[PDB]
């Protein structure tokens, strides 16, 4: 039994690879084939403690945890095979008032999802975990219905499933080489023979880096060491009838679960103390490392062993049977890389799982869906394999991983900042200049200004669930833009040059807006076949046949991958260039933005010569620039595209030419306050693959009646005619000391009816502003709803958008 022909080759028989093989086979894919080096579970999967909780601190990752657990509950009936899924529920513990607030943060974030999650009181916690030291316990965050599973059994069950549905699981069959073919398919080599696969999937655990290099890619991954401790029988545990729920001690930084008649607990020690396999990155995985563990090291986790002994008194008396120390494949930010990989054909990855046991199930069905449908079933850009790039070096990878381990259980504040491995190489000289004058934000490698420091006001990282030190500065920056002229570094934008004979034809089929004529620029969306908003671009037509596409920083390679894929698919004759790192961008915006820039260029900038959305090459003080009259602030202004190495000089001249008009800097926190005022939508908050552009209110950029048959045109017609179920709205609400930021529950008459997608304090009306999705029947101007912020419901009204008109709408009303 050997196929040389396969639809899909899955490399690696960990829980993740096998889960995928199962899903694809069951979904009806023919000739699925998984290749495993040695035996199923041989990597990290066999050693795990198999905690599986419904809890996640993000958003759509909740779906992954959800699908995995629902799957796991079914498998025993489905496959005839036992999986040893224990479901006593999980509790995360709060011992401080800031930790209670974190639980409130998470509740508003979870109340609009089907995941079941509550904040429980001490008395209840003690009812469920009677061996808990209740001295300092203030509250628990409780997910009933989860717990932990046996990773061996899980995977074995999944494999019988896979086989039952037609997959072929071959081992020992290690992949040794990989060769792309001109038609987009792959030759795979193993010691049992060749397979010609239509597509390949890397699921190779801590070998996933090595497998990437067989095809010339550097996967930013590093195996770390993690340890859990297993105790002997404990009378008081044996004595119970019901299993103890799984705990997380957030302050002690360890998880803990019942294990037979004893306990198992696992620290996340400090970034300074943790260990990782940098030697395995430099020289690769030792061959013959299989099914094996590292030597135990209690000493380096002692501080967490102690906290645990005091939180569970019973541990003081018990003995330690065993300590499991094994590797986990981390990516820098702790999340995996799941999806099709940019810049090669038909390569997919499901790699670098901090939490593969809990993610396997959901990721299987997620990837399966993406593979079969050509688009993901819901948005998980946060796992996009190409959120990383050449800036994600081994040195960075190694240092961020360490931080992400050590930070496992620290308090997760909104607008969190982390400093490890920064700055990367992905900066201009502008960094040097502005670093000490602002809080720099990290964005896919770049250092971009969030907010600027004010004299006589605190400048330090000061995280909070409520308003903090940047609140006042952000209001001044907001003022600065409405009253004078602000300068913002927008250099992180994703930038692509498209030319060749089919440039126009390609774009016309990708994007739902008309393609602007040469000299002009518009906003345009790439939709999926089903009509989801895969991306928002701004499209500049620069010379006949030649274009610049601009996108958000988080969408760089994600958008490129899609465009490259469509160009190839329709045999389009074009040349696509990623010029992201070649260029810097400065936004100059506010009423005095013409007056200032005029001083620096012989080009005529009057509203006469130079209209809104036009693009023109010029020189700004002997520095060549591509000037687009646009601004996401919605105030008068330009974006100035230039060489990276000029960004300092250009900045310098601009700021100097603006003394008189009182020019100053502004950053992204302010920007958000401004665009939100103008009812501007933001890709990734107001729309992504979970949204069609009509429910999001992007009707103005969607030309259904343009000739070309662009991706999603028909799905859109069908949606429009079936009538909307929900709509994005703009909401105002008064608050004491907190602003919506998005992902908060919207309530109406005692029930959750939707969610906020983003938000900010509006400094002009002295109230908070949000964007939210609500049911249509409740989307009228004037409608009253409640918005849950940090455990309190605040009333809110829907308003007529926009709250403030753009400068071009204001200007063109002055004539009429
Ligand atoms: C070490 C550890 C990990 C762990 C844990 C506790 C400890 C001490 N507790 C966990 C938990 O409570 N909950 C959870 O969700 N995860 C937990 N983990 C981590 C977990 O083990 C991993 O996240 C997960 O097992 C990763 O699975 P994945 O399928 O991604 O990778 P793998 O299990 O290592 O399997 C990789 C397989 O691919 C094969 N391979 C390697 N090279 C090749 C080649 N060249 N060709 C074909 N196949 C290959 C390997 O043999 C391996 O079996």
CSV table of N, CA and C in Angstrom, one decimal, residues 3 8 10 12-35 40 71 75 78-81 153-171 364:
chain,number,residue,atom,x,y,z
A,3,UNK,N,0.9,5.0,-2.4
A,3,UNK,CA,0.5,5.9,-3.5
A,3,UNK,C,1.7,6.8,-3.8
A,8,UNK,N,-3.0,15.6,-1.4
A,8,UNK,CA,-2.4,16.4,-0.3
A,8,UNK,C,-1.5,15.5,0.5
A,10,UNK,N,0.7,15.4,4.0
A,10,UNK,CA,0.8,16.0,5.3
A,10,UNK,C,2.0,15.5,5.9
A,12,UNK,N,4.1,15.0,8.9
A,12,UNK,CA,4.1,14.9,10.4
A,12,UNK,C,2.9,14.3,10.9
A,13,UNK,N,3.1,13.3,11.7
A,13,UNK,CA,2.0,12.6,12.4
A,13,UNK,C,1.9,13.0,13.9
A,14,UNK,N,2.0,14.3,14.2
A,14,UNK,CA,1.6,14.8,15.5
A,14,UNK,C,0.1,14.9,15.6
A,15,UNK,N,-0.4,15.4,16.8
A,15,UNK,CA,-1.9,15.6,16.9
A,15,UNK,C,-2.4,16.5,15.8
A,16,UNK,N,-1.6,17.5,15.4
A,16,UNK,CA,-2.0,18.4,14.4
A,16,UNK,C,-2.1,17.8,13.0
A,17,UNK,N,-1.0,17.2,12.6
A,17,UNK,CA,-1.0,16.5,11.2
A,17,UNK,C,-2.2,15.5,11.1
A,18,UNK,N,-2.3,14.7,12.1
A,18,UNK,CA,-3.4,13.7,12.1
A,18,UNK,C,-4.7,14.3,12.1
A,19,UNK,N,-4.9,15.3,12.9
A,19,UNK,CA,-6.2,16.0,13.0
A,19,UNK,C,-6.6,16.5,11.6
A,20,UNK,N,-5.6,17.0,10.8
A,20,UNK,CA,-5.9,17.6,9.5
A,20,UNK,C,-6.3,16.4,8.6
A,21,UNK,N,-5.5,15.3,8.6
A,21,UNK,CA,-5.7,14.2,7.7
A,21,UNK,C,-7.1,13.7,7.8
A,22,UNK,N,-7.5,13.5,9.1
A,22,UNK,CA,-8.9,13.2,9.4
A,22,UNK,C,-9.9,14.1,8.8
A,23,UNK,N,-9.7,15.4,9.0
A,23,UNK,CA,-10.7,16.4,8.5
A,23,UNK,C,-10.8,16.3,7.0
A,24,UNK,N,-9.7,16.3,6.3
A,24,UNK,CA,-9.7,16.4,4.9
A,24,UNK,C,-10.4,15.1,4.3
A,25,UNK,N,-10.0,14.0,4.8
A,25,UNK,CA,-10.6,12.7,4.4
A,25,UNK,C,-12.1,12.7,4.6
A,26,UNK,N,-12.5,13.0,5.8
A,26,UNK,CA,-13.9,13.1,6.2
A,26,UNK,C,-14.7,14.1,5.4
A,27,UNK,N,-14.1,15.2,5.1
A,27,UNK,CA,-14.7,16.2,4.2
A,27,UNK,C,-14.8,15.7,2.8
A,28,UNK,N,-14.2,14.6,2.5
A,28,UNK,CA,-14.4,14.0,1.1
A,28,UNK,C,-13.2,14.2,0.2
A,29,UNK,N,-12.0,14.5,0.7
A,29,UNK,CA,-10.9,14.6,-0.2
A,29,UNK,C,-10.3,13.2,-0.4
A,30,UNK,N,-10.0,13.0,-1.7
A,30,UNK,CA,-9.5,11.7,-2.1
A,30,UNK,C,-7.9,11.8,-2.1
A,31,UNK,N,-7.3,10.6,-1.7
A,31,UNK,CA,-5.9,10.5,-1.8
A,31,UNK,C,-5.1,11.4,-0.8
A,32,UNK,N,-5.7,11.5,0.4
A,32,UNK,CA,-5.0,12.2,1.4
A,32,UNK,C,-3.9,11.2,1.9
A,33,UNK,N,-2.7,11.8,2.1
A,33,UNK,CA,-1.5,10.9,2.6
A,33,UNK,C,-0.7,11.7,3.6
A,34,UNK,N,-0.5,11.0,4.8
A,34,UNK,CA,0.3,11.7,5.8
A,34,UNK,C,1.6,10.9,6.0
A,35,UNK,N,2.7,11.6,6.1
A,35,UNK,CA,4.0,10.9,6.2
A,35,UNK,C,4.6,11.2,7.6
A,40,UNK,N,3.4,7.7,14.9
A,40,UNK,CA,2.4,8.7,15.3
A,40,UNK,C,2.7,9.2,16.8
A,71,UNK,N,-15.4,18.4,19.0
A,71,UNK,CA,-14.9,17.3,18.3
A,71,UNK,C,-14.5,16.2,19.2
A,75,UNK,N,-15.7,11.9,19.3
A,75,UNK,CA,-14.8,10.9,18.6
A,75,UNK,C,-15.0,9.5,19.1
A,78,UNK,N,-17.9,8.1,17.4
A,78,UNK,CA,-17.7,8.1,16.0
A,78,UNK,C,-16.8,7.0,15.6
A,79,UNK,N,-15.7,6.8,16.3
A,79,UNK,CA,-14.6,6.0,15.8
A,79,UNK,C,-14.6,4.6,16.5
A,80,UNK,N,-15.3,4.4,17.6
A,80,UNK,CA,-15.4,3.2,18.3
A,80,UNK,C,-14.3,3.1,19.4
A,81,UNK,N,-13.6,4.2,19.5
A,81,UNK,CA,-12.3,4.2,20.2
A,81,UNK,C,-12.3,5.2,21.4
A,153,UNK,N,-4.2,8.9,23.0
A,153,UNK,CA,-5.5,8.3,22.6
A,153,UNK,C,-6.2,9.2,21.6
A,154,UNK,N,-6.2,10.5,21.9
A,154,UNK,CA,-6.8,11.5,21.0
A,154,UNK,C,-6.3,11.3,19.6
A,155,UNK,N,-5.0,11.2,19.4
A,155,UNK,CA,-4.3,11.1,18.1
A,155,UNK,C,-4.6,9.8,17.5
A,156,UNK,N,-4.5,8.7,18.3
A,156,UNK,CA,-4.9,7.4,17.8
A,156,UNK,C,-6.3,7.3,17.3
A,157,UNK,N,-7.2,7.9,18.1
A,157,UNK,CA,-8.6,8.0,17.7
A,157,UNK,C,-8.7,8.7,16.4
A,158,UNK,N,-8.2,9.9,16.3
A,158,UNK,CA,-8.2,10.7,15.1
A,158,UNK,C,-7.7,9.9,13.9
A,159,UNK,N,-6.6,9.1,14.1
A,159,UNK,CA,-6.0,8.4,13.0
A,159,UNK,C,-7.0,7.3,12.5
A,160,UNK,N,-7.5,6.5,13.4
A,160,UNK,CA,-8.6,5.5,12.9
A,160,UNK,C,-9.7,6.2,12.1
A,161,UNK,N,-10.1,7.4,12.6
A,161,UNK,CA,-11.0,8.2,11.9
A,161,UNK,C,-10.5,8.6,10.5
A,162,UNK,N,-9.3,9.1,10.4
A,162,UNK,CA,-8.7,9.4,9.1
A,162,UNK,C,-8.7,8.3,8.2
A,163,UNK,N,-8.3,7.1,8.7
A,163,UNK,CA,-8.2,5.9,7.9
A,163,UNK,C,-9.6,5.4,7.4
A,164,UNK,N,-10.5,5.4,8.3
A,164,UNK,CA,-11.9,5.1,8.1
A,164,UNK,C,-12.5,5.9,6.9
A,165,UNK,N,-12.0,7.1,6.8
A,165,UNK,CA,-12.5,8.0,5.7
A,165,UNK,C,-11.7,8.1,4.5
A,166,UNK,N,-10.6,7.3,4.5
A,166,UNK,CA,-9.8,7.1,3.2
A,166,UNK,C,-8.4,7.7,3.2
A,167,UNK,N,-8.0,8.3,4.3
A,167,UNK,CA,-6.6,8.7,4.3
A,167,UNK,C,-5.7,7.5,4.4
A,168,UNK,N,-4.4,7.8,4.1
A,168,UNK,CA,-3.3,6.8,4.1
A,168,UNK,C,-2.2,7.3,5.0
A,169,UNK,N,-2.0,6.7,6.2
A,169,UNK,CA,-1.0,7.1,7.1
A,169,UNK,C,0.2,6.2,7.1
A,170,UNK,N,1.3,6.7,6.5
A,170,UNK,CA,2.5,5.9,6.3
A,170,UNK,C,3.6,6.3,7.3
A,171,UNK,N,4.2,5.2,8.0
A,171,UNK,CA,5.3,5.4,8.8
A,171,UNK,C,6.0,4.0,9.2
A,364,UNK,N,-7.4,21.5,12.4
A,364,UNK,CA,-7.8,20.5,11.4
A,364,UNK,C,-9.0,21.0,10.5
